[PDB]
Design a protein around this ligand. Structure first.
Ligand SMILES: [Zn+2]
Length: 71
């Protein structure tokens, strides 16, 4: 039994949180969606990988930050 282990999100600047992901049969890699859940900041980004294309990392940043870059 192992369904109570908390993992660690690989931070890369902004604090993003996972709310939901999407899968595609035509794509080998899954679609992970996150969102900058900072004090007052509510940005939502989408991490999708273009399969049909020669490895295309299409990322859509919905919203603008309002807390500057962390230290
Ligand atoms: Zn932010």
């Amino acid at each position: 039994v192992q369904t109570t282990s908390e993992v660690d999100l690989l931070d890369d600047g902004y604090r993003w949180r996972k709310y939901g992901q999407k899968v595609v049969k035509g794509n080998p890699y899954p679609r992970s969606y996150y969102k900058c859940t900072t004090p007052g900041c509510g940005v939502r980004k989408h991490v999708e990988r273009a399969a049909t294309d020669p490895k295309a990392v299409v990322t859509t940043y919905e919203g603008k930050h309002n807390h500057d870059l962390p230290a």
